[PDB]
Amino acid sequence: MIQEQTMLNVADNSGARRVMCIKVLGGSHRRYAGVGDIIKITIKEAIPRGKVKKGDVLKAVVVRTKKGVRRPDGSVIRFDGNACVLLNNNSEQPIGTRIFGPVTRELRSEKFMKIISLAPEV
């Protein structure tokens, strides 16, 4: 689940609507990803009225999956589709300004120290 060389849905504005996954990064020998994992993205069509350019590389975080969040809230938390939020590929934090839905407090992991400044559940 979550595949390389395969499209991923966008959960913020000005970052196009479908973007290509190339690497699922993450833990020791892992060939999959879930909510709050980080993904390496590549953009070919970009939609030039947004904030992203044609032929460029980005960093994203997984925010919606059908399997969802499993441990921290005493109940499973499922989401609709398979979607991510785009982040600056060096300087961190989002490149859009309108993240969709509530997101989740499971994103408060060791890989994020400034995410707590955003207006969702994070």
């Binding site: 441990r71 921290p72 809230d73 005493g74 109940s75 407090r105």
Partner: protein, 209 residues
Amino acid sequence: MIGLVGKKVGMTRIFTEDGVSIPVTVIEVEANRVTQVKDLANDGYRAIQVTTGAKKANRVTKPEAGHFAKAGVEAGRGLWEFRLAEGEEFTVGQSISVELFADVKKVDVTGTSKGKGFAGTVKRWNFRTQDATHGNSLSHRVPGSIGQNQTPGKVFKGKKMAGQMGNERVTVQSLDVVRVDAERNLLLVKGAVPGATGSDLIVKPAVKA
């Protein structure tokens, strides 16, 4: 040293403000008789009898109650003689109950297992079976044997082979305690333990760190 026996009663939730509800398993224990010790009088074995099992006899085995102490006889559903090491106890009458145990923080837990269906090789070892699509007649899930080529004239049993499983003891070297009631004889432990409702369990204070 101390130890008690009981049964798995079911699952509960303790709750937190961190949103986790936390699974906690309930056990109800019995008080321990500690009637007598077997200590070096003939043969080198040492053991302490906790007994505690009481079942209506008709039935119920004889020699497993054939050397009971100078007390009212209560046999069946438990004997739990095990093995004793470096305990220097009273040879007769060292009884204990839950007020000696309610201050315990971490426990060592033991029980018995049952078969995983047919066991064989698939449920015994978690193996994969041969496929039936575009090939193979009658040779899909058959259990196999220790087959090897005869060039050495002797057999080799290095392949993991078919048989039965369970009917044995299983143990936990540490489990955290959550809730205790020394009037209801209740011991509540963090997370899960083997078997289902009404299954017999043995519990004592942990000696592993």
